[PDB]
Structure formats: structure tokens, C-alpha cells
Symmetry: D6
Subunit: 167 residues, 12 copies
């Protein structure tokens, strides 16, 4: 059964490959450059950063993805949800199950009022999937991210604790 | 003539009074608590943080406001604009002039593609002022901030470099 | 008008005098010993401790008390409320007003679900004051604190955010 | 013979597995997230913390559980008792034997006047077992812990040194 | 009225004068040498040393003595009591009042089971006074301290918490 | 397919031999001396230096070159491009492909307005090739670099984001 | 008589006023933002940086300007010359005298082979002045600097040690 | 032949086992808890502590005990002698021979005037053995140590340099 | 009355004047060079150095000399005695009185078995004086110290604890 | 291909054996003592010392010598040349080849104006060899170095950049 | 009477004025640039550098010069002598008196075998003066120092301990 | 051939065995206690301590002894010589050969004027051996060292550079 576990230091190599894949680092709007020692040092810096929850999406003792509950605001009770599924493990529905695991973690464990995610406006399939899981289209960010030579708009979607607990 | 200057350490006392005023710290969605030594230490921590531009809005050698260009992203070329006008200096049009100087700084000095701000949805006066200065309503954040016992939505507004260069 | 402001380093001398008063440090179950440099160094240690909110209770620009929202849990959304009124300022209703300001701060600003306090069972006056503001007797801690040669029981009282906002 | 030994650094992997089990980290009211390096760093930080006694519950040279005497107050002579039995080693009475060993340690070695524990109110079996071991129901904490999406009340139970030495 | 207050850093000069008087530093079996910066640094190193309670014996806002509850063992619940009265303030019974205050502090505040002190065997007056205040002669240490060219025996006296509360 | 990846610490051995090859370190105007530990320490010092992007040019999991986007100015949005191809990997057209990969990275990922490079004026082959890829001869630096006993002039060439995206 | 002296820490306030003048900090292509503590920290960091020589241009014991010999390469024997004259001291020919003093220092003291400077292409008057002192236009940098909302070209001019000593 | 050697870091594991045996840690009146890293860290802290001499009692290349000359006072010329024999090596007279080796070390090497030890008052056999080796019963400490739930008195015994040199 | 007190940091200027007097620094065999900050730093370095006891020889609240008990060996129970009397206070017998005070301190307080001093062979008057106070000529060191261009022999004299206590 | 490469940390053992050979350390006027960790620590300390260029003279993947360009003055443009050839590799002309390579490095790469070396006057063969290589006898240092119990004079020889480039 | 005293930190301002006078900093071959904080930091770094002896040449409590015994080699027993007399105090014979004092210090105090100095060849007067005080012309360094735009040769002069002591 | 080499860190184990042999460490007047980590830490502390020269006496690639030239005074040019020969390698004349090697090192390499050693007065054989090697009995130190329960006098012997060079 697919599960979320803490992103451990020994796992960083996996993250390393994800952080240097331009296609992967386009879904998140991140520059696809990170030396392994740079990633290690940043991980060490954020070991005790409580604003973050970094998860390995694991299936059968296998690292299939990375789920991050970042920018966790403990007064406003909101967190940004981000997800990457390794392309070798795509097509198994791991994205939706990991998203639901992260939603349960933020709403049930972290006691968050709001979860929000940011996807590319071109990625209409992701918007439809997140709407199927319960996310509502909250807004559109115009020219928010410079990706592969062009300014891309983003769809920010959100879900709330009451709507999640009711469903 | 209204001017922007760097927020100096010796000015922090002024900022202190703004950072512990609940009414002032409601426009920004900040908890109205900051010990002076806490503000001083955080200021020292961000002395060389290039993601930030902290400005004293000065009129006739007197500190009338605080303008911040924060979260300066140098790849996506966007920055969050924040403004506080001292309540004793409100009603002089200082807000619009300081906003125009901050826009000029981000677009002309920092070479930013996008400026964005976050205001309260109830704050119709600020929304009108920002629309007059060139900001467009970009989106609405639902239950984004817990303010004075209730979850408030926010209006995120944005302006772009081309529209600024048009004027 | 009675107000709460952040406990500043420059105020510590006042706190010092409160922290070495055995009668005052009996209301809280604290050992009435603290060298001034010890208190200063502990304050410096907790400058950026977000589990704490230390307040000078100020009336007419004069330090009349100390209110602390400590053990701030941001997942369970509860905090311990503690209050001291300087004996020179007792009888002015400062205790009830400072308690109400701290309750409003924890429930409306900090978005806390629960406030709890712990008083001595002998202190029926404080129990009455806390019942007047809305606190409910939550439980009894048997022989919880060693005070002046004897094991004293304590009354733990609590209030919740919904009941506070209703009244 | 079942024994308690100090929680060693080399044992932390065991602790790691317990600290990310949501079911296990629900009896203790702890968020079930801890990277292994985070647990290691916290353990190193608390090596010389005398407020703590961390025990591996060992049976036949095997780590079967974790017993913690935390919040050891040396003036009020009380400590919080917490226990975890690995789910694969449950049903052998290890919980009761480890509880009796920890009580003997706190009362006879640490010279504690009082031991207290906090269990979930739903866990009536644990309350009954601890009452059989000598613990008295001390109080109820209302909505004290946010567990798996709901606010749970807790039962705080206590035992005293005189009653322990008499039996 | 004579009181005990924490030994503050600003008081150290007073202690300095006492720590370099050979006659005074004979009652305690201490070498009468301590540079002011040495005493200051040792005080700073032990600011957070909980094994110690250093008191200025104060009468009418004047430093008349120094009382130390050192070697505070929190498992065996015992502490060594030491006292110095400034020779300029001797003959006012300040020693007995400060001793009674320190006894009350160790037994009632620190919850100590035992207080012990060590005096010179030649100082029969101190032994008689401590018997009057409640101390029991516990034993004699042979050639325990080298004082002014000769090995002196010491009288170790003790008092207990139950007998203190009875008297 | 030839690719760019981050220059990893484990790759530094490769770089070491390139940094001590006088012929190679003549194309760049660098002194051909660097102890391996010196290179390691400088790499560690610049791990989080965002002014730099150091790339291993990799072909079939083999280190064939080094591409550096250095002096990345995020206000003027320009960066200096430098490239080395390993001499045993010369003649494979790796230089032009790595140059196009670096151009795409600086213009499309880093959102640079301008790329500039510096070659020796004697190196007409590089000027011809860089003109073929789109670089324009921007200027000539007279006696700019002391190489192998003589002051050499350099050709500085530049390319811009609009002309790159059009082609 | 106009002289060059080392830029002392005590002089930094003067530099501060120059570093936040947008018009002044436009001739040099520097962002016109620097908190005083930021400038102070950068000065302290570069106290022992031998790549730079920072000079106060002093006339009659008055700080009239700032001359910097930066990017001093000791293998290629070149340095960048930069100059600012305080606007209240412009029109006295201080710029030319300070420039000649700086060239004499770089060529005669630092034994530099080459001096280069960078001015705005719009500033044709400065180019003519530098030609009058002996500088030759070395090259033009296309869209090199983002100044006041537009990409500006720069004129890089250079002078050499032999031609300087001949004149 | 039984010998004393310095307690080395590599030996600490052995000490670890002795430090976690409650029966062993009853002869010394020490809490039988010490994590291995805690013991290691304390050993590292006391590497250059000249107040102590920690000895492995070795017989036939085997660690059979631990002898400590602690609290070495170099003015009063006294030291506390403590000894532990591993339970697997009891019955060989190792305790008495190691005690005599430690006596010779303190009197002949350390030039101590006095050695003192502390045993439990119930352990009359140890008192008689130490009287056989030359120790004299010096005094009795009432309720000095809390051991296994009860306050135990201790017998402090002493030996002096002159009588030891005579024997 | 002439007394010895600890050499305080604020006194170092006095010591400074003594340490740069070539004539004074010939009696001790010290190079007569010490910057004031050098002396201060060494004093700070040896604040907690128990191998030395540095004394201001004070007469009528005036610094008249410097007495040092250095190289205090606590196993061999010996220390080197050195004394300087300020030349402006010579002829008052301060040297002999300070020597007797230092002897009493080393023998009676520090429990030293032996005191030794080293004087120049030319100073037969000091040898006679020290023999009057009780020191015996112990030996002669040939060419031990290079003083003012020549190797001088030294007389090492010693005194013992038994002979001191008898006289 | 006799070559110079950077002196790497891994090579230090080789240097170690050269640094403790009294005969080898007579050509250089160095004390023939250096612990391996001392050499390592000094090497690490001078990793980023630009006044130094330490070279392993390597022939056929074998360390045959050590060439040092030390005291590199970048203003006066001079450096001291030192060379050691391992005695097992003497007689192959390695000294002359390494000397010429070092001359080419200082004059052509480091752009040095002057090279100087210091040899023993007794070593007339080396002076003759360096004159054959192009070095001119610059001067004689009288009693400059204490070598094997006697004061030895040295011959300082020099070469200049113009004469080197002419030949 | 003219004297030498240690160069104190408080004197550095004087040194500062000397260190930025090009004419003064030509006799010593030093670059005439040193910020006051740079000089202070270098002074602090070399406080405990025993290779150096920095002297203020003082006449009637006034700083008239600076004498340095640098590069003190304690095995070869040689030191470089450098002297500066402030031009306002030149012509009083202060130079020769300070030189004689420095020679006496190096030969009689520091036990140096050799003193050497380096002057410019143009300064034949300095060579004659040093020959009058006892210095011997030891050698000539060709193009040793780049001063005011030209390579100057230097005269190195030396004096010895035996020749100094013979008179 | 017997040789001296630097005492390396990897050799410390050997030294360790010598430093805990009571008989060996009595000839030197050292307490025979040193933990291996203590010896390692002191060795690391004195790596760059120029006051000492620690030598392994090596015979046939084997550590047969330890020779120390300690307390090296570079002003008075004297050093203390100490030697230990491993008891398994005594009777080969290693002591005399190592002593002559150390004498040659101190006199010829370190340029010492004086060597001194200190032996026990009972060791008439060592005094005779050192007189045969050239040492002269310089003096006798009364009760200088406490060894094995008794105060031992010592014979200090010395040799000078001229007498050594004559022989």
C-alpha cells in the first residue's frame, strides 16, 4: 500500500535526480539545477524547520515520489501542497493517492484549515484531477513563472478542512 | 518631496511601533507582536538578504511610512509589494506616492517583470488606489488569513513592467 | 486604557522584581530565585521562541503587570495563560482586563482552540476571576506543586475559541 | 527477564520506526513525523538533559519497547510517564512489566513524589490497566489533543510515592 | 527586615572583598585569592548552574552577607549551606536570621530532605549556634582542611526537612 | 544525447586535471595551478553562490566537458559563458552542443537578457563558431590577459534573449 | 590640495549618502540601495581584500569624493577605476585631479599594466574627459546595464602603464 | 599481576555496563542510568580534568574493575577513593589489591595527605575490610543517599599519608 | 599595613610600567618588551590558570609592588617566588615584608612544601637578605640567562615548609 | 616530460621525508624537523595563500622533486625559487629541467619581473649551474644561516623577465 | 632622553599617518595604503608574534618615530631593522639615537647574531649614516622594489653581535 | 644506524606505553598517568609549539626511545634534554647515542648555547654517563620532586655550545 514517510537524508539521491530533471522541475516551478552537496546542505538546514513536511511517497519499499507540505503557516492554518511522481512510477494512480495522503496529513495531523497547490495553467488535466479529489480552482496567477523561455500563468487551487472532513 | 530610503537599523524603533499596532498589522496580515530585540535580530539576519528591499517612506526628513519589496524572485522576476503609512501621516496621499516610488524601484531598478500585492477584500479604498496606480485585480485567496478572530479572504493584485513602461 | 505590549528586554528589571517576590512567585508555581543576568539570558534564549508570547500589561504608559501565553502548541492549538499584577496596581481590575486582552490575543490573533491556566486551589479569588471571564474548571492536579514546605493541589481551568467568540 | 536500559544512539533506528507510525504516535499525542537525522539531532541535543530518562524496554536482548520519564521536575518531584510497546511485541504483558519497572525507577531511584501519565479518553483499557497497576484517575483534559482530524480529550492519571512504597 | 536576594552580577565586587579576606575565607575553607575578573567569569559560567543558589544577605537595601546553597543534589535532596557575614555587620544576629532564611528556602522552596554545613572544629561558637537553630552534629572530618599552615578537622552538621517543619 | 548536469563534488577530480592543463587553462585566462584540496575548498565555498552555475557536460554517462555560467547578474540579467571540452573528447562537436545547451539554460531557465563570452583574439576558430551559433563580436580588450609570457587581447562576444528566441 | 587617502570606516556615512543617490549610483551601474549597516559590514568584510583600493578624495580636510581601484588582477596587472565626486563639490575640477591621482597610484604604486573604466554610452562628456586625461575608448558593451528601466550600453576605456609613464 | 592503568576512551563500553548495573551503582550512590554517548561526552569533558584519576583495574589483560581518585584537592591534599569490581571478577581479592594500588597512587604519586571513601552503613563487611587495609572510620552521614526507595546513611572512612607510609 | 592582594585587570597598567623597565626586568630575567594589549591578553589567558598567584603588593591603598608565585606544582608542592618593588617605593623594607607575606601564603595557604627563587649572581645583597629571611643558597645556574648582552649566572635559593613553621 | 604539478595533500608524505633529511634541508636553510601532522596543518593553512606555488616535480608518474615559488610579491613582481631533487633521482638533470620549468612558470604564467634563489656559498657547483641556466650572482649574505653548528654565508642569485624572454 | 617603548594599540593613529605617507613609506618599501581598521586588525593579529618587536621612538613623552625589529629568526639569530622618523622630528639626530637603541636591543636583549637593514640605493646618506653607527654594506638587490613607477635597487647592510660588543 | 626522527602522531601509542610505566616515568619526574586521548590531545595542542622538539629514537626502523628538547628558550638559547629508552632496548648504548644526537641537534641545528638535564640523585650511574658524554654537574635541587612517596633531590647537569664544539 502506498504510504508517505519522512524524506530522509539517505533518500536525497533520489530527490537529486528529480531536482535535475527539467521536465519534472517544470511541474513545480523550480530551476532544474541542484548539486548533490547543495541539496544535502539545504536539507540539513531545514531538518528542524517546522514550516516544512517533506515526504517520500513509497510503494512496496520503493521511492515512487516526493510530496511536500511547505509554507506551513501555524496561525493562518494553511500549507502549500506540492507533489512529484517519478516518471518510472507514473500511470499507477500514485499522484492521486499521494495527494489524498498529504491532504489527510495536513488536515488531520497538522490541523490545517487550508491546503493550496499551484499547477501550470496549461496542465488542465491536473486541474481536473485535483477538482475530482476535492480541490477548488481558487485563482489564476498571470505570468507568474518563467518556464522554458516563456512566462506561464498558474492555477492556484485550494481545499479546506471542513470540506475534507465532510468528504 | 516624498522619497524612499533604505530602512536603517537606527530606524527600527519606528518600525517597532508599526509592528505592534494591531490596526496597522491588520492591513498586512501579520501578528501584531514583535519585541524590539526580536525585530533588531531579524533585521540583522536579513541585512544581506537580497530577496528583500526595506524602505522608509520619508517626507521632510520624517519617517511617514514603510515600503517593502519582499520575496524578490530573480528568475521569475516578481516581488511582493507591501505598504504601511503611519496613522499620523494618513490622508496626505503618501500611500499613492510611496506605491509609485516602489513600483518605479521594482520595475526600473530591480528590473522586475511583475509586482504583486495582497490586500483585504473588504479594503475597497486600497483596491481602488492600486487600480488607479496601475494594479489589476489578479485573484482572490479564500480564507487566506486568520485576522481578528475570523478567516478573511484577500485580493491579490498585480502589475507588469510593460504596463508601467506604457506610462 | 489597559493594554498588552511585548515584553521588551529593557523591561526585564520590572520582571526581575516580580520574579524574586516569593508571594508573587507562589501564584505561579515558580521558584522565587532569578539573578538579573539569568533572566536576561533566558529572555535572549527565547527571543525567537514562537512557543511564547510575553506581554507587559501597561496602563497609562506604566508597567502594571506581566501576561504570558506559553507552551503555545500550534497543532493542538492550546496555550497556557499566566498573569501577574504588580501588588502596587492591585485593586484596579487590571487582572480581569489583562486576562480578557490575553484571551482575545490567543483566540483572535494566535487562532488558538484552547486556553488553559493552572492556579492554586487555595487561590479562590483567582479561580473566581477566571470563572468570571469564562474559564471552566477543567481538572484537579493532586500534590502537583511543592510550595512553602507543602504539596499543593492545583486547579487547571480551560476556555475554548467557539465559546469565547459566542460571548 | 524484561529490563529497562538507557536509550542509546545506536537504538534510534528502532525509535525512528515507532516515531513515524501514526497509530503508535497516537497514544502519545505526537505528530507522526520525524526524519531519522532529526531524531538523531534531538537525541544528541538532549544527551545531558536531566529532565529526561529515555529507556529501551528490552526482552532477551531485543528492543521490544520505549519507556520515557520526561518533564522530570526536581523541585516538585514529579515526572510524566510514557510507554510504547512495539506492535509485534504486544500481548506478552510487556506494557505492565515495563510500567512497573519505570514506576520503581521514578519512585526508588529518581526519588519522585508523583508520577503522572496521559492517555486518550477512548483508551478505557489503558485507564483500567493503569488503575490495576496503582494509578489513580487524576483529571480529564478537554479537547486537549488534535488526533486524526478530531479534538480528543485525555485522561491524566497519577500515582504517589507513599502509596507505591506501601504496596 | 533582613532578607535573602539572588547574588547579582552587580554585587560581585562585595563578594570580591569577602573572597580575598583571609580571616573571612577561613570560616569557609577557601583559599583567600580571587581576581575580580576570575570571580566574574566563574559567576557567569554558573549563571545557569542549578546546583547553586547564591544569595546576598540584605538588610535595609545594604549587602550584609553572602549565603550559598551549593552542591544541591536533586536525587538525594541535600544541599551544603555556607554563610558569610561581613565583619562590619557582625554582632546584629544577621548570621542566625540568614541561616533561618536559607533553611526555609532549602526545605520549603527547594524541597530538600537534608541540609548540611561544615565548620571548623575550633569554631565552637558556630557549632553551638547551629545547634540552637536546629542543626545536628553529624560527624567530624579529620585533617580535612589545610588552614594557615595546619591541618584542621571540621564539624559537619545536618538538619532534616521533617524536623524543620516540626519546629 | 549530450546533456548538462550540475558539477558535483565527486566530479571535482575531473575538473582538477582540467584546471592544471596549461593549454586548456589558456583558453580561459586562468593560471594553470590548483591543488585538489584548493579546488575542493573553493567549490564548497561556492556551493550556495547563486552567481554561478557549474555544469559537467556529460555524454553517455561520461564527463566530456565543463560549462560555467558565472557572474550571473540578476538585475542586469547577464552572465558570462565559459566552456571547456576534454582534449580526448575533442572533434566530436561537443563544444557547439554544450554551448547551445548553456545558452538555452541561461536564456530559458535563468531568464538572462544577455550572455557574453571571452575568447583569445588569436582564437579565430572560436569567434567563427560562436558567430555561427549566434554570438556577435561585442568588443576587443587590449592586453587584457597575460598568457604564456605575453599580453594577449581578447574578443568579447555577446548574444541576447530576443535574438536567441527568434532563432 | 586635493589628495587621496584610504577610505576609513569612520568615513562610511559619507559613502552611505553617495550609495543611496540614484543619480550618482547611475554613473556607476550599482543599485542605489544600501543600508548603513550593510555598507559597514561589506567594508569590514573587505578590510583585508587586496583586490581593492578604496580612496576618499579629500580637499582641505573635507571628503569631496570616492575613488575605487577594484578588480585588481595581480597576474594580468589590471584594475578597474571608478570615481564619484559629491554633487556639492562638483565643478571644482576635483574629478580630473582625483582621476590623475588614482592613475598615478595604480601605475606607479600598484605597478599595474592596465587601467580600465566603464561609463555610460550616453555620457559622451565623460568619455571626452577621459580621452583628455589619456584614456582610449577600448570597447562598447551592448545592453550591459539595466538603468532606470532601460538597458544601457557602456563605453569601456583603458590606459596602459608605458603610455602613462611616457606622458 | 593486578595493575591500575588509565581509563581509556576505548574502555568506556565496559564502564557503560557498570554504570547501568543498579546493584553496582548502589555501592557508589549513583543513579544507574547513563547512555553510552552521555558517558563518552562526560569522559571527553574530563579528559584534562586534573581533579580526577580514573583507572581500569586490569588482571591478565582483562578489565576487572574501575578505581577512581576523584575530588582531588591539591591544597587540602585529599581525594575520594571509589572502587567497583565487575561481578564476574568478584572473589579473587581484586577489590583489596586495587584499593591498595589506589592508596599507593594517591599517597606516593599524588602526594595526598588524606584519602577518604564512602560506603553504605549496611555494608559492615566493606568497613571491616577497609579497616584491615588501614582505613579508619571517620564519620557517619545520616540519610545521605537515596538508594532503592530509602534514605541510607553512609560510613565515611579515611586514611592518612603518615600511617600509610609507616605501613 | 602592607598587604598582598590579587593582581586585578585594572591594575595591569602598573604591571605594564614594571614590565617595560629594562632595569626592573633584569632582576627577573624577562625581556623588557610587552605591549599593553599583549599583557592584558596574557592576563586574560591566565585568569583561571591555577599554576600562578599574581599579587599586587599594596601599601596604604597604593600599588607598590608585584609578587608572583608561579610554576605552582601541586604534586611536588613547590613554586617559584618572584618579587618586584616599584623603584619609587624602594627603601621602605617593602621587599622583605612582601617576601614574608608571599612565603606565608605559599606555605600556610597553598600548602607548598618548597619555595624557590632565582636571582642574579651579581645580586649578593639579595642573596644575603634572602638568607636573613630563611632562604638557603640551593645552587648556581651557569650562563642561565642572557642579560644585557652577556650570559649571567644565577643563584637559585630555596626555603622549606618545616623550617618556616619552626621559625 | 619532466613536469611540475601542484603539491597535493596526498603528496605530503613524500615532502615529509624530504623535510626531515638533514642533508636535503641543508640546501634550503631549514631546520630538519617537521612532524607529519605539522606539515599537513601548515599545508592546509596555506592552501589559499597566493604568495606560494608549491610544485611536485614529477617524471613518469613519479615524484622526483619539490619546486617552490615562495614569497611571491605581486607589487614588486619577484619570487624566491627553491628546489629539491630527491637523492634517488639525482644525476638525471632533473634539477636543471625543474628549475627551467619554474622559471617559465614565474615569468610566463605568474608574469614575474624577478626570480631570486639563495644557495650556500660552499655549494659552488650549484652557483655555477644556475649561472649556466641564466641566473646572475646578485649578492652575498654574510653569516646568514646557522648550518650544522657554524654560521654559513649564502649566495643570492637573480634572473629577470626581459633576459629570460630574450633567451 | 630619547627612548624606545613598545608600540601600543593606542599609538596606532600615529603609525597610521606614517603608513599612508608615500614619501615616508618609500624608505621602507611599503605600499602607502592602510585603512586605520586594517592597521588595527593587523596589529591585533601580530600581538603575540614573537618574530616582531615594534617600538615607538619617544622623546619627552612624544611619539617622534617608529622602529621595527622584524623577521626575528631565533635559530639563525638575525632580525631586519627598520626605522622611520616623522619629518616634523627629523634633523634632531633622533634617527641615529633610535638606531643605536634598536641595535642595543637586538644584540643585548634579543641575543641576535646579526642585524640587517634594507635602504634605497638613491639614499647614499642613509648608507653613510648606518656605516657611521656600525653597519656594513652587505649586498645589493637589483630591481628589488617597484617604487613610484620605477624598479629601484636596494642596499642591504648588516652588523654583527661581536663587532657591536667589541666597542 | 640509530637516528632521531620527529615524534609523529601515529607513534603516540608507543609514547603512551612509556608514559604509564611508573618506573620509567620516575626517571623523568612525571606522574605516571596519561590516558591515550589525553596524550593525543596534548600532542595536537603542541604541534606548532616551538618550545619543544619531540623525537622518536629509532633503531633499525624501530622506535626504541623518546628524546625531548623541551623548554627551548630562544632568547637565553637553552633547552632541557630528557630521554627515555624502552627497557626492552637497554644495554645497547642507545641512551648515549641518542643523547649525543640530541646534543648535536640542540647545539648545531637549534643553535642553543646551553643544554641542561635533571636526573635523580640516586642515579649516580646516569650522572657518570652524562659526565662521560660531556655534561657537567651544575647543581643539586633539594626535595625537588615527590617520587614514590618520598621527596627526592635532583642533580641538574649542563653542557655549553663551545665545549661541545671543542669535543
Amino acid at each position: 500500500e502506498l504510504k508517505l514517510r519522512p524524506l530522509e537524508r539517505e533518500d536525497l539521491k533520489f530527490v537529486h535526480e528529480l531536482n535535475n530533471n527539467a521536465h519534472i522541475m517544470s511541474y513545480w516551478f523550480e530551476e532544474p539545477y541542484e548539486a548533490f552537496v547543495e541539496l544535502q546542505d539545504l536539507y540539513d538546514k531545514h531538518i528542524h524547520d517546522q514550516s516544512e513536511r517533506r515526504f517520500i511517497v513509497e510503494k512496496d519499499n520503493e521511492m515512487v515520489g516526493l510530496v511536500e507540505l511547505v509554507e506551513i503557516d501555524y496561525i493562518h492554518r494553511r500549507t502549500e501542497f506540492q507533489i512529484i511522481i517519478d516518471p518510472n512510477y507514473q500511470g499507477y494512480g500514485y499522484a492521486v493517492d499521494a495527494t489524498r495522503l498529504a491532504m489527510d496529513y495536513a488536515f488531520s495531523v497538522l490541523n490545517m484549515h487550508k491546503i493550496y497547490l499551484v499547477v501550470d495553467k496549461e496542465n488542465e488535466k491536473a486541474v481536473h484531477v485535483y477538482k475530482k479529489v476535492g480541490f477548488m480552482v481558487e485563482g489564476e496567477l498571470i505570468d507568474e513563472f518563467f518556464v522554458d523561455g516563456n512566462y506561464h500563468n498558474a492555477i492556484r487551487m485550494c481545499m479546506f478542512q471542513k470540506q475534507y472532513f465532510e468528504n
